[PDB]
Each structure stands twice: as structure tokens, then as C-alpha cells.
Write a protein that holds these residues in place. Structure first.
Motif, mmCIF file in Angstrom:
data_model
loop_
_atom_site.group_PDB
_atom_site.id
_atom_site.type_symbol
_atom_site.label_atom_id
_atom_site.label_comp_id
_atom_site.label_asym_id
_atom_site.label_seq_id
_atom_site.Cartn_x
_atom_site.Cartn_y
_atom_site.Cartn_z
ATOM 1 N N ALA A 264 14.675 -3.967 -10.560
ATOM 2 C CA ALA A 264 14.940 -2.518 -11.124
ATOM 3 C C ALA A 264 13.508 -1.769 -11.137
ATOM 4 N N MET A 265 12.522 -2.168 -12.074
ATOM 5 C CA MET A 265 11.418 -1.582 -12.363
ATOM 6 C C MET A 265 10.731 -1.262 -10.781
ATOM 7 N N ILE A 266 10.892 -2.187 -10.099
ATOM 8 C CA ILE A 266 10.278 -1.946 -8.696
ATOM 9 C C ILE A 266 11.242 -0.757 -7.946
ATOM 10 N N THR A 267 12.396 -0.947 -7.581
ATOM 11 C CA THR A 267 13.389 0.000 -6.783
ATOM 12 C C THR A 267 13.179 1.434 -7.515
ATOM 13 N N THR A 268 13.001 1.382 -8.515
ATOM 14 C CA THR A 268 12.971 2.808 -9.439
ATOM 15 C C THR A 268 11.734 3.248 -9.236
ATOM 16 N N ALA A 269 10.617 2.479 -9.069
ATOM 17 C CA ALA A 269 9.183 2.809 -8.800
ATOM 18 C C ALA A 269 9.054 2.897 -7.597
ATOM 19 N N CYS A 270 9.839 2.653 -6.564
ATOM 20 C CA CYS A 270 9.732 2.716 -5.086
ATOM 21 C C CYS A 270 9.910 3.792 -4.441
ATOM 22 N N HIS A 271 11.012 4.124 -3.963
ATOM 23 C CA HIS A 271 11.531 5.550 -3.114
ATOM 24 C C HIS A 271 12.872 5.590 -3.192
ATOM 25 N N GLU A 272 13.108 6.383 -4.124
ATOM 26 C CA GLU A 272 14.925 6.849 -4.103
ATOM 27 C C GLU A 272 15.250 7.754 -4.924
ATOM 28 N N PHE A 273 16.354 7.953 -5.441
ATOM 29 C CA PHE A 273 16.755 8.995 -6.533
ATOM 30 C C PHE A 273 15.742 8.760 -7.590
ATOM 31 N N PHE A 274 15.623 7.477 -8.151
ATOM 32 C CA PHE A 274 14.435 7.214 -9.392
ATOM 33 C C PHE A 274 13.213 7.992 -9.460
ATOM 34 N N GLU A 275 13.386 9.007 -10.201
ATOM 35 C CA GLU A 275 12.260 9.988 -10.407
ATOM 36 C C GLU A 275 11.944 10.447 -8.719
ATOM 37 N N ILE B 230 1.005 -1.161 -0.136
ATOM 38 C CA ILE B 230 0.097 0.070 0.104
ATOM 39 C C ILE B 230 0.858 1.299 0.131
ATOM 40 N N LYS B 231 1.971 1.179 0.630
ATOM 41 C CA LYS B 231 2.934 2.218 0.368
ATOM 42 C C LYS B 231 2.888 2.867 -0.674
ATOM 43 N N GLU B 232 2.543 2.211 -1.776
ATOM 44 C CA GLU B 232 2.599 3.139 -2.977
ATOM 45 C C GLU B 232 1.387 2.292 -3.952
ATOM 46 N N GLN B 233 0.218 3.037 -3.866
ATOM 47 C CA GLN B 233 -0.783 2.320 -4.703
ATOM 48 C C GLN B 233 -0.614 2.583 -6.063
ATOM 49 N N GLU B 234 -0.014 3.801 -6.655
ATOM 50 C CA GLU B 234 0.114 3.735 -8.181
ATOM 51 C C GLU B 234 1.472 2.984 -8.361
ATOM 52 N N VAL B 235 2.376 2.792 -7.823
ATOM 53 C CA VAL B 235 3.341 2.027 -8.287
ATOM 54 C C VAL B 235 2.808 0.354 -7.822
ATOM 55 N N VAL B 236 2.378 0.287 -6.881
ATOM 56 C CA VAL B 236 1.788 -1.020 -6.314
ATOM 57 C C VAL B 236 1.067 -1.715 -7.854
ATOM 58 N N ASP B 237 0.545 -0.741 -8.559
ATOM 59 C CA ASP B 237 0.120 -1.068 -9.800
ATOM 60 C C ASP B 237 1.023 -1.305 -10.617
ATOM 61 N N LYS B 238 2.176 -0.517 -10.780
ATOM 62 C CA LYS B 238 3.484 -0.720 -11.662
ATOM 63 C C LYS B 238 4.445 -2.107 -11.180
ATOM 64 N N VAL B 239 4.704 -1.851 -10.007
ATOM 65 C CA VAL B 239 5.751 -2.889 -9.332
ATOM 66 C C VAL B 239 4.911 -4.106 -9.616
ATOM 67 N N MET B 240 3.450 -4.306 -9.460
ATOM 68 C CA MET B 240 2.777 -5.737 -9.872
ATOM 69 C C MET B 240 2.616 -5.724 -11.350
#
Lengths: 92, 92
Positions: B79-90, B48-58
Motif C-alpha cells: 500500500a505505501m508503495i502503490t499509494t506512492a507509485c502512480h494511481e488515484f493515490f495523490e 528510477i520511475k520515481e526518485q522521490e518515491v523510490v526514497d519512500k517506497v524504499m
């Protein structure tokens, strides 16, 4: 284990530079990609170290998402490389 | 910098387990992939920490090379996850 997430939080840092260390935003170029393999995989600094993979490692470096190596790309290519370099990935 | 190659030599270790920690050789399954994100990215343990990414990560976890997550895959999806998670990535 965590070795991956932690290594992942490290790439977000690598891109920070590899992506904005010249002018581009969050992507890279066949040139920066080389630095990514030479600034971290010194073993490839010689490249000859792996003729069959030099063909593979390069097979991607020539394409690199055709244009620039973005987020999932550096992590990707670096992966296609590291996996074709020398480690668990296929014996070594 | 080296932070990547070193993080790369670490994945060759992650796969060693994620790949041969049950029976498969050098690949993974939508199930092991989850452990790869829960054993390293605890933040996603909640997802849930990331609903929009939960969609991507999934979005990828559902495909995962359609079948099993192999070498360039775990490094990819992670990578697709980590990048869509929480860090420099975007930003983060």
C-alpha cells in the motif's frame, strides 16, 4: 503475483470513492470504513460471523488512525480485517 | 466497492506464495518484498520511475516491520508503495 498490483490499481479506485464520495479528500472515517467492509466483505455484514475477530476487526475500526482512515489505512485496516476474516490468512 | 474484498481474497493468495514460497510461514523478507513489487508493479522494476518515491517506497522496504513483512505488512508496504507509485493515490 500481479494479482496484487492489479488489486492495488483497484484500491486507488476504491479510495477515489471511499475518499471523495462524500466530501473528504483522500481519507475516510470510522463510518465510511464500515461501508468499505460491508460494500466488499458482505460476510461481515453480519459481523457475528466472527466473534473473536469481530473484536479484532473492530479493535482497529475504533482506532482507524484515530480520526480518519487514509490511503495506507483503508489498505491497512481492510488488511487487518481480511487477514482476520476468512482466507489463506491464518488458515481461514 | 467489492473491487477491494475481491482484491483482498487475492492477497490471501499472494501471501500463500510470498509467505510459503521459500520456507517462511506467514511472513516475508526485505527480499521477497522486492519480488512482490517487481512481480506485480513492473513499473518499479526500474524504480528510477520515481526518485522521490523510490526514497519512500524504499523508506519502508528497509524497515518492513524491521525483519520480515507479515500479513498486514505486505498489504501495508504494498500500500505505501502503490499509494506512492502512480494511481488515484495523490493524483498519480
Amino acid at each position: 503475483m500481479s494479482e496484487l498490483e492489479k488489486a492495488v490499481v483497484a484500491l486507488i479506485d476504491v479510495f477515489h470513492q471511499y475518499s471523495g464520495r462524500e466530501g473528504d479528500k483522500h481519507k475516510l472515517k470510522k463510518s465510511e470504513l464500515k461501508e468499505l467492509i460491508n460494500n466488499e466483505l458482505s460476510h461481515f455484514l453480519e459481523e457475528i460471523k466472527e466473534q473473536e475477530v469481530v473484536d479484532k476487526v473492530m479493535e482497529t475500526l475504533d482506532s482507524d488512525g484515530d480520526g480518519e482512515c487514509d490511503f495506507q489505512e483503508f489498505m491497512a485496516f481492510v488488511a487487518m480485517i481480511t487477514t482476520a476474516c476468512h482466507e489463506f490468512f491464518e488458515h481461514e
